[PDB]
Structure formats: C-alpha cells, structure tokens
Amino acid sequence: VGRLIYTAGGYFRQSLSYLEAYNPSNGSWLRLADLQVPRSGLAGCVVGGLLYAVGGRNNSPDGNTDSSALDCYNPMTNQWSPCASMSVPRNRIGVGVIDGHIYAVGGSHGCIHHSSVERYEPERDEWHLVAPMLTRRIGVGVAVLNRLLYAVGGFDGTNRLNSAECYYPERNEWRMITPMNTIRSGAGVCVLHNCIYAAGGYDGQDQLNSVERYDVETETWTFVAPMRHHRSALGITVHQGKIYVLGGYDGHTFLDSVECYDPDSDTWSEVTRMTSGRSGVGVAVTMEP
Numbered sequence: 001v002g003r004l005i006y007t008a009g010g011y012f013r014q015s016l017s018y019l020e021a022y023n024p025s026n027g028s029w030l031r032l033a034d035l036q037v038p039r040s041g042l043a044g045c046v047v048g049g050l051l052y053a054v055g056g057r058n059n060s061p062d063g064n065t066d067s068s069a070l071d072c073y074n075p076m077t078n079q080w081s082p083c084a085s086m087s088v089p090r091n092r093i094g095v096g097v098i099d100g101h102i103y104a105v106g107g108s109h110g111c112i113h114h115s116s117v118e119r120y121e122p123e124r125d126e127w128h129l130v131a132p133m134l135t136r137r138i139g140v141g142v143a144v145l146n147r148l149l150y151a152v153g154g155f156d157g158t159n160r161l162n163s164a165e166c167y168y169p170e171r172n173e174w175r176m177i178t179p180m181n182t183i184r185s186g187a188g189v190c191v192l193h194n195c196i197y198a199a200g201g202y203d204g205q206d207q208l209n210s211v212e213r214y215d216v217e218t219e220t221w222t223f224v225a226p227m228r229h230h231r232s233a234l235g236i237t238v239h240q241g242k243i244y245v246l247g248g249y250d251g252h253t254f255l256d257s258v259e260c261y262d263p264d265s266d267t268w269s270e271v272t273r274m275t276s277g278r279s280g281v282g283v284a285v286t287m288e289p
C-alpha cells in the first residue's frame with residue numbers, strides 16, 4: 001500500500017520541470033518539488049525507494065541542451081539531489097534496473113545516435129560503460145524481466161526500427177530477439193507477467209495506438225487490445241498488475257490522457273487526466289511523499 005505513479009519532466013512548448021504523482025487508490029494528483037533543470041526525453045526509475053531522473057534534454061526558447069544528468073528524488077524529504085553524471089548526454093533515452101543497478105541505454109546527443117550503454121551503482125555513486133547494443137537506438141524502449149534487459153525499437157539515424165535485443169548481464173553481451181510486428185520509435189515499453197509490452201510509438205508515418213507483447217519463453221510478439229489514443233513519446237509504468245500510459249503526442253495534441261490496461265480482460269480504460277498535456281515524461285512508482 002501507499003505507492004504512487006510519479007511523472008517527471010516532459011514537454012509542452014518547452015521542456016518542463018514538473019514532478020507530479022498520481023494515487024490510483026483515490027484519483028488524486030500531487031504537485032511535488034520541481035526538477036532542478038527542465039527536461040523532456042528522460043526516463044525515470046526507482047531503486048531503494050528513491051526516484052531517479054535520467055538523461056533527456058532541456059528544449060527551451062534559448063536552445064537545446066542534451067542531458068548527461070542523473071538526479072535523485074527522495075519522497076521522504078520532497079527534495080532532488082544530483083548524482084554522478086553519465087559518460088555522455090542521452091536524450092530520448094531508455095532505462096532499466098537490474099538488481100539495484102540502473103542501465104542507461106542508447107539515446108541521442110545532437111546528431112549522434114548512441115549504441116552505448118552504461119550502468120550506475122547507487123552505493124558507490126558511479127557509472128561505468130558496459131557492452132554497447134548491436135544497433136544504435138534513440139527513442140528506445142527498455143524494460144527488465146527475469147534479470148534480463150530488453151531494448152525495443154527506436155530510430156538508428158536512418159530508419160525507425162521494429163528490431164529488439166536483449167542484454168545478458170553475466171555475459172556482458174547483447175543478442176537480437178524476434179522483431180516486433182510494427183516499427184515503433186518513442187513507444188512505451190514495460191514488463192507485465194512474462195511479457196515485454198510495447199505500446200504506441202511512431203512508425204515513420206503515424207503515431208500508433210497498437211500494443212504488442214513479447215513472451216520471453218515463446219519468443220513471439222502478439223497484439224493485445226489497442227489503446228484508445230494513438231500516442232508517441234508516452235510515459236508508461238506498471239502498478240498492481242496493470243499498465244498505465246501517460247500523455248504523449250497523438251499527431252494533433254500533447255495528451256493529458258492516462259489509460260490503464262487490465263490484462264485479465266484485455267481492455268484499456270481512461271483512469272485520470274494529467275494536470276496538463278505533455279509528452280516525453282519519465283515515469284516510475286514508489287512510496288508516497
């Protein structure tokens with residue numbers, strides 16, 4: 001009990017510093033301490049009850065600064081603190097956590113499309129590079145299942161991708177997995193039960209409402225019910241056995257919609273709206289502040 005869905009950063013006209021937290025048990029939103037630097041295209045994660053904001057970019061009227069930053073929010077103090085920075089700026093990043101360590105995957109720095117990957121150790125406050133992906137990927141979706149890390153879709157500098165790959169930590173090695181049925185860049189990627197879900201994204205022509213899941217045992221991708229709204233650059237997380245998708249861009253509007261997927265019924269419902277429409281947020285779940 002007592003866990004909230006935290007959304008950090010995002011973009012609407014410029015990158016945003018908002019940190020807001022949604023309580024599924026009562027429908028309420030809380031506005032919390034702003035990020036120290038506005039950022040969109042970041043990712044969020046939680047280790048040890050602390051919320052981390054990783055990478056992104058400050059897209060402002062005065063220009064664009066890609067972020068190498070790692071910042072930590074403590075709900076017990078409602079305070080952000082800087083951590084050690086990554087080796088390189090990473091906008092449009094994906095992150096996953098394996099056994100208490102944060103993996104920062106891919107992303108962009110200006111016209112550079114990264115294949116590099118690095119791993120953060122919170123107890124030592126240090127980053128170190130690990131093996132790079134087989135493919136350069138920006139707008140990559142990342143999730144962890146059974147202590148294996150998956151990098152899904154994205155854009156390699158020339159094409160949006162249906163490909164995906166898995167990192168095997170004990171071998172420090174990446175291997176391709178079955179490609180998705182749909183090209184997806186800027187999708188929401190998460191884990192639920194024994195599958196990696198990829199929701200939404202941009203296929204090179206339209207923002208998508210389709211959702212597909214990779215069963216790590218059978219190596220197949222299967223479509224599930226589509227979202228009500230097409231969305232790219234959506235936030236995503238899992239909480240109490242359901243997927244939540246937050247915001248994004250539908251080709252017309254920066255959405256405030258939050259939808260929730262129930263795997264038992266294979267249906268999506270609208271559960272709340274964010275306080276303002278935005279895309280490119282980081283999202284994670286931890287205890288209330």
Ligand SMILES: Cc1cc(C)c(C)c(S(=O)(=O)N(CC(=O)O)c2cccc(-n3ncc(C(=O)O)c3C3CC3)c2)c1C
Nearest residue numbers: 011040041092138139155185186202232233249279280
């Ligand atoms: C529409 C729009 C306009 C602006 C100015 C911004 C900042 C944004 S954003 O904040 O959410 N965003 C950060 C950024 O683009 O710098 C951002 C965040 C995550 C992923 C991506 N991503 N990666 C590759 C591709 C691709 O098209 O293949 C995309 C697009 C989402 C499909 C982008 C948005 C949407």
